């Protein structure tokens, strides 16, 4: 069974977060409506020395702000974070940074959705500001993609 959890979560009921969609991998604003953990065993404490309960243990149940029709969806803790808020300007970007940026996999020249990405190239020539990144970081990432929206790269918020 699922038990409601009030301590381990980094995000509380009613708080807004960014949540990573389970189908497309992009980040969308959402409201936390419930935080749960798996039920402890009958003869085990909620937290033990062998297995200290951890924030990564919780499941967040969220409702997307712009997709209410999707209903309440369950999120792994790695798929919820504080809303993005700070751009990393062009001059501060570098290879190896992991950022949230805007990319359209189907039409890469055009505006898309917001994905985690690892910068793979960063160079300014007389002709262009070249930014490439491995986009949709995780399984089946899109490697070494040319990024259009080089002035709209966000820092990822971390606890």
From Swiss-Prot:
Post-translation changes: Ubiquitinated; which leads to proteasomal degradation. Autoubiquitinated; interaction with USP7 leads to deubiquitination and prevents degradation. Polyubiquitination may be stimulated by DNA damage.
Coiled-coil blocks: none
Result of changing residue 18 to A: Impaired binding to histone H3 without affecting the protein folding
Effect annotated for changing residue 67 to A: Impaired binding to histone H3
Position of the Glycyl lysine isopeptide (Lys-Gly) (interchain with G-Cter in SUMO2) cross-link: 155
Compartments, as annotated in UniProt: Nucleus
A Gene Ontology molecular function term of the record: DNA damage sensor activity
Induction pattern: Up-regulated in proliferating cells, and down-regulated in quiescent cells. Down-regulated upon adriamycin-induced DNA damage, in a p53/TP53 and CDKN1A-dependent way. Induced by E2F1 transcription factor.
Phosphoserine PTM positions: 41
Tissue: Expressed in thymus, bone marrow, testis, lung and heart. Overexpressed in breast cancer.
Gene Ontology terms: biological process: DNA damage response; double-strand break repair via homologous recombination; epigenetic regulation of gene expression; heterochromatin formation; homologous recombination; mitotic spindle assembly; negative regulation of gene expression via chromosomal CpG island methylation; negative regulation of transcription by RNA polymerase II
Keywords: Acetylation, Cell cycle, Chromatin regulator, DNA damage, DNA repair, DNA-binding, Isopeptide bond, Metal-binding, Nucleus, Phosphoprotein, Repeat, Repressor, Transcription, Transcription regulation, Transferase, Ubl conjugation, Ubl conjugation pathway, Zinc, Zinc-finger
Region Tudor-like 2: start-end pairs: 92-159
Residue span of region Tudor-like 1: 9-85
Function: Multidomain protein that acts as a key epigenetic regulator by bridging DNA methylation and chromatin modification. Specifically recognizes and binds hemimethylated DNA at replication forks via its YDG domain and recruits DNMT1 methyltransferase to ensure faithful propagation of the DNA methylation patterns through DNA replication.
Record text on subunit structure and interactions: Interacts with DNMT3A and DNMT3B. Interacts with DNMT1; the interaction is direct. Interacts with USP7; leading to its deubiquitination. Interacts with histone H3. Interacts with HDAC1, but not with HDAC2. Interacts with BLTP3A. Interacts with PML. Interacts with EHMT2. Binds hemimethylated CpG containing oligonucleotides. Interacts with ZNF263; recruited to the SIX3 promoter along with other proteins involved in chromatin modification and transcriptional corepression where it contributes to transcriptional repression. Interacts with UHRF2. Interacts with FANCD2.
Disease: Defects in UHRF1 may be a cause of cancers. Overexpressed in many different forms of human cancers, including bladder, breast, cervical, colorectal and prostate cancers, as well as pancreatic adenocarcinomas, rhabdomyosarcomas and gliomas. Plays an important role in the correlation of histone modification and gene silencing in cancer progression. Expression is associated with a poor prognosis in patients with various cancers, suggesting that it participates in cancer progression.
UniProt comment concerning the protein's domains: The tudor-like regions specifically recognize and bind histone H3 unmethylated at 'Arg-2' (H3R2me0), while the PHD-type zinc finger specifically recognizes and binds histone H3 trimethylated at 'Lys-9' (H3K9me3). The tudor-like regions simultaneously recognizes H3K9me3 through a conserved aromatic cage in the first tudor-like subdomain and unmodified H3K4 (H3K4me0) within a groove between the tandem subdomains.
Protein name: E3 ubiquitin-protein ligase UHRF1
Record organism: Homo sapiens (Human)
Residue range from the parent sequence: 125 to 283 of 793
């Amino acid at each position: 069974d699922m038990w409601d959890e009030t301590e381990l979560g980094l995000y509380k009921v009613n708080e807004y977060v960014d949540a990573r969609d389970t189908n497309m991998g992009a980040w969308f604003e959402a409201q936390v409506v419930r935080v749960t953990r798996k039920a402890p065993s009958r003869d085990e404490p909620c937290s033990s020395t062998s297995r200290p309960a951890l924030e990564e243990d919780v499941i967040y149940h969220v409702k997307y702000d712009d997709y209410p029709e999707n209903g309440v969806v369950q999120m792994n803790s790695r798929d919820v974070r504080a809303r993005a808020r700070t751009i990393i300007k062009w001059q501060d970007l570098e290879v190896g940074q992991v950022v949230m940026l805007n990319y359209n996999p189907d039409n890469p020249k055009e505006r898309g959705f917001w994905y985690d990405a690892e910068i793979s190239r960063k160079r300014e020539t007389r002709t262009a500001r070249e930014l490439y990144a491995n986009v949709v970081l995780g399984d089946d990432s899109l490697n070494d993609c040319r990024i259009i929206f080089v002035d709209e790269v966000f820092k990822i918020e971390r606890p």
